[PDB]
Design a protein around this ligand. Sequence first.
Ligand code: CL
Ligand code: CL
Ligand code: CL
Ligand code: CL
Lengths: 279, 280, 280
Amino acid sequence: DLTQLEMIIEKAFDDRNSINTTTKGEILESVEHALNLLDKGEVRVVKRQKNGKWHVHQWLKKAVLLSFRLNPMQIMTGGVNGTSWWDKVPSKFSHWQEADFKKADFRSVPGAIVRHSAYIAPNVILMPSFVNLGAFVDEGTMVDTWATVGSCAQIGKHVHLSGGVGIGGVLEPLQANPTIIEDHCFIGARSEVVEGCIIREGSVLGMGVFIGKSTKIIDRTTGEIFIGEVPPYSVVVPGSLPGKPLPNGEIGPNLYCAVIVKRVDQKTREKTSINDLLR
Amino acid sequence: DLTQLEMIIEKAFDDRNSINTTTKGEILESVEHALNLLDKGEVRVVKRQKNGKWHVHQWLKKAVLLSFRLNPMQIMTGGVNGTSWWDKVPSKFSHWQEADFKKADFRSVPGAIVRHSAYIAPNVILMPSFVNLGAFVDEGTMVDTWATVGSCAQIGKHVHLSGGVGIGGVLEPLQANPTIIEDHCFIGARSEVVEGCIIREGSVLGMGVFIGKSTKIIDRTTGEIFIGEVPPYSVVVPGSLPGKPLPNGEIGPNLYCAVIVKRVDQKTREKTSINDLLRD
Amino acid sequence: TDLTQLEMIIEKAFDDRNSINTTTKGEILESVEHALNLLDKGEVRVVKRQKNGKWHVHQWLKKAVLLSFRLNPMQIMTGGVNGTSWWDKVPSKFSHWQEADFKKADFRSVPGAIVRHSAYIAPNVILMPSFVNLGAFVDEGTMVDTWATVGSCAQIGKHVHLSGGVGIGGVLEPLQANPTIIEDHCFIGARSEVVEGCIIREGSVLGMGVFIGKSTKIIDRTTGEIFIGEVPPYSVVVPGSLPGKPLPNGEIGPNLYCAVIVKRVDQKTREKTSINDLLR
Ligand SMILES: [Cl-]
Ligand SMILES: [Cl-]
Ligand SMILES: [Cl-]
Ligand SMILES: [Cl-]
């Protein structure tokens, strides 16, 4: 029953300053249990509504924040020459055996790093990469080498996160939607989507696309400006817009922006290659 | 030997649907032998032609593809607090001891990750980074921190792959050339070269240069446009080209492109610093 | 200890560095080891800021780092996947560190973090999976986010945020060159890169994808002043581009990348306004 669990987390978070490494009992159990529900993908930090809008369940963010006060800093073994690390967030794979990996049915390449409470769906491929607390990585998604899925981020099904891609983490403010990459998006290498922006489903981002909360996204044919959202089935590449003249009157510098070069549909995505879409 | 090895692999590749983790015998031995030849650099995914063009040895890609079918997913130890990974590609350094590292004569910094079948030449420095299956990293090359040498990529001698540089992997389609970086190239930090593009020898890429299959590469002085290839001894920086206007009457956005600002030669390259070449 | 005599020995040993090797022990080894422990503890640092605000290099600490390369052999370092090894000659900072050492040092080291010995990491720093190289200085309360790199001898001021994929470029030789310096309270947005000894002055905010090297043009949008290798205090910086010369065919040429200071604020504005507003 999620209803009771949320109630405790809401009230315990209100008294969060009294929570520490000595707190046990119902508060400790509720937070832990919630992080296991997250780790399994049974709950998620944000859920998509019928309208297509995403709504945050704040008590899950509060549970993650509360886990920082509950768990102590500890020696974590496994470093070079038998040295240690010093942290208070366990790996997702703590106590995982072959049977556990067979059940989860995803591939974790040596170098992959995943914190507990992050959900990894079946048929995902984790290259050497980092997945932070509360993230959700759905069916068949590729997380390529040195990619980062930040806290609470949502990665949809059959997403390709290319090498060096950063999906920015979003914990506070509590009301903020985390960064969201919807189903069937291609995120080109070195791209970055942060600060709770959403890439609507079927979109294709070329290499070097940066999308933050205050990034101008312009449809090259329409003239429309989007903030924090890329509409469905968009092909997006990096560009620049003119700036204000310099104080001496000389032509001003251009400023970076994201450029929507195509808006397609589902049939176009299934029929046309990524490279053709970007050409 | 090589003729018969190629034949065994290609016959098995045509029968790849009947191949799985229970397949042993000559097919297993041939695939393992082919990947060991790749690992020591005795064969490589590509051959340079007389034309100056590179073509793929498709049977070697087939060996790599078969090894996915032959090897089981398994526990691989060494994670934090004794946790494991779950993969079916062994490390290049499996069973390597001091003597293996001394014979190989390259430097492997803790954090470096190299899968078996990747060739790493003498005097290479692997900072924390990742080198994928079938890659070739030639003599004296620097692989800097969080760089990636993708599957089958060919990196020439005395190349500097700066921090966070990605050389994109190319396995299928079988006929597609991998990404190639020829001798004495410098690739500045955060740059990316993917999808089988080739950076010819002695070229210098500034920071943040992206080179993909459909990237316009323009010589600013010549006006010449290149696609998928940077000509020899080019100095390349990130830039932009004008776009079409919006219907509302506003000028359209510029779009990213790669800009050749200089084309030099071996003598110019050897005497002049990277920063001077990029300064103008 | 007496720093003056230690400097004298390091200086003399470096003049005869060709006679220094992996067999060398005695006073020279102890002196180099001591200086790197001083570097690791932050009791000494590769550069110190002067009264005028200029940074001055302590060349003898660079010489000590260089000598430790000659003193220590290439060796097996354990901890790789499936019990495999690395092959390097620089010890981890965390060699022999226990809970008491971590509790005393009072910073947080997340599994995946990599730090070489001689790098100082101050209290309340958070090291995500990342790399900190020799002689670096990471001051109080700084966040080093995932796949960031703090290059050799780099100086990171207090309460700096190095976002994901940020590169702070290393500077060892030339001995006289100042390393890369990031002053107090700076924000460095994701995928940004600052290399080749550039300095970002106190309180500045760099957007995503900002690359600053020695030869990157930085233009002040508000004054029009052009800076090279230095960003003034409390600058807001984003990536941009400047126009080029026409092509020989008569068409407009490509733009070339540059860094743009779009606003310059102060300490009070910085404390009151969020990073996101500063970038709008
Ligand atoms: Cl753990
Ligand atoms: Cl296949
Ligand atoms: Cl292995
Ligand atoms: Cl060590």
